Amino acid sequence: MRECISIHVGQAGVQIGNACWELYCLEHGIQPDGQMPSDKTIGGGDDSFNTFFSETGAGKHVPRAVFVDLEPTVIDEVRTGTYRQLFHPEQLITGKEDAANNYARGHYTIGKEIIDLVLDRIRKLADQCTGLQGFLVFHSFGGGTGSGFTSLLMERLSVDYGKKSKLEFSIYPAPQVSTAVVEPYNSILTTHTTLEHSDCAFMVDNEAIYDICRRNLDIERPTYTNLNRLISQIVSSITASLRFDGALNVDLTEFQTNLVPYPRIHFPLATYAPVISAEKAYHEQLSVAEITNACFEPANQMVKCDPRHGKYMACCLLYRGDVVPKDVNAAIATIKTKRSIQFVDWCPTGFKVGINYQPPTVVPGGDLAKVQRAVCMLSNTTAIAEAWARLDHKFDLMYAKRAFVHWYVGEGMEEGEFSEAREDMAALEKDYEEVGVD
Template structure:
């Protein structure tokens, strides 16, 4: 039976990341920008990618995806761009008026105007599935549409599709770079409203990805395209086991099972290696041990926090390309003896088994070599790894955000913009209390074994 996955791209960040992801998926599966596949390839392909693409009557492959933004400019770029024939016009939903970086506009006023249309378009996509597995949601925490509309949509997805998995790829506010002064408000409001609806949220922040582009690729002023192409490699690695045939296939539920020890602690950070420019690729030997070690270095992680200050609860390593299980075995053994990499004492050696048991490590190997978009700054390499790590160090990012929220909320700065859109001031306090509880959850998890906990059965 097919196990289809529907991707939902919300707001500027979600749509632009979506653009980069579908560009990469098409290259990986040999699908042309108009959705057709050259006939010489059709005979020798496995059709595992139909979890992400549906085949239209015309023989065209169409992404199982929907793009939503409350204003049209970003989606218009897709409507007129290289991949304009890949998507059906009904897969693009735009409003006329943007959320103006205001969670309340995205969730209450402007968002309410398009939610029913979006739900019916999603319903149409689900009716085209024989065994829907779940949803991937792409968005930013800081924008008005990404924060407000996504949380409204997640509530409806939970109501409409019950227990279907919902995994998020979210752009988290950066420590120094900010696109809007009210990012901390939007982020904390949306984290609170989606905490019960999202099963697992993979986080990245622009500043961390920006620094990776600068230091590793030598791009002096990285653009969103640079950032998104790098982030799309992470998305590709995470979804490779869902899109390619192989004995190590995994479904969305397994990511949750392996990475989320308690329902609320569901924010793994991502790292990817090697990120290397074409000039350097010829001179560097990138063994499995090298790229594995790179993932545990703070400079390669996609959220600005220091994992050496926290403890790992679960780690998932997803390899691609020319990788031998023996080498992985050795690389992981090296990691376990590294003193600066600490695991919580209740985790079974910190790594989880799932697809193949190598020293009880959660490892995936996909023998398809990593693909790069022509003209991008990243070199084509024979092997790569993506690490997803649930670590207590991410608490540092929440603490930083809460502090910024408190500075503004103490003066009630900008609150009138939210109340003017039908929100109550009490929602701010309620969301902030929930985030304080989330910080405490991380503290407790780092300190104790979960055995005596009431939550024990969740583990």
């Protein structure tokens, strides 16, 4: 068994992770007070769920996670919520004033005074691990912390844990749920300083999660609670291979091995289905060919874009529930003859399939209905390049006038790091076009 440490940076990172560890305890049968009746090995053991949870002498199953925020309001929710007895105070770290949506404030000014503290707390968790696999970093591109302090943490993690793997769960900024303006700057700044240090990042667009809350769940004004409960459902499907028995995506190394051929192009796309409203009278259960066939509809993409005009480099199908391999192959064959699935010539045209018989656990009193079989597809598509273009265009429209550049320059940062990072993104879009277009 090899452990996996979780790190949540910023409000988005903290809240999301908080909903995740709620879903984890329900999926593994872990009570709010930490007790796990099914766990017969008391005080220790090398089971598949122990990669996320540790065990005390008193039978308390504690997560291997860390919550870091520069303002205490969001983390105090964890210090007093339903699952307050899970974490101990070491894992919850809070500053006093935030980075005011400023990246320079999260990377330099403020982050400099707390960076050593977070590493010391992450160290304590690594000291319990017999074989640390790496870290999963949850953060937002928009926040000053999730963008600024995250990159600084990532840069350090590569120094103290060189051979370890680091995955990301990044919240891509959507103006529909955000009242900020300087988000395009933070995003391009955090992606330039974290690129060489992240082995695989899964982007979630608040705009995509938002619509799925209105179109499928019939929620007129989705809140962060609605958005988080859905995001954690995807986080669960992508991390169950590390928390259960199986052979597909068993350790963090296999995420890059299976999903990332080229180093800089490490941004898969996530597609999930079904998403049914609990308020519905009652839904006819979809077949395996139906939920699988839905993994190609944009409405169920964690990032809005058109893969029909891109090329694939990898493709994983993580099923959960009543799914048999026979049905997966048939559904796959039918999808090829109808869909446009163009792979790159230097990669085989294939799919890696993983099946977990436990259906998706739904939070009691939640927005999602209980389904008999759900699937989450991960696929490295050059179509995801659409997301970098939109964000780059906004960076240019503002930077062309130096709008807001003084708040950043006023925290010690140099203006060159704006064009220095923008030049890098211009290269990233250049790599996607070399691999997808003719």
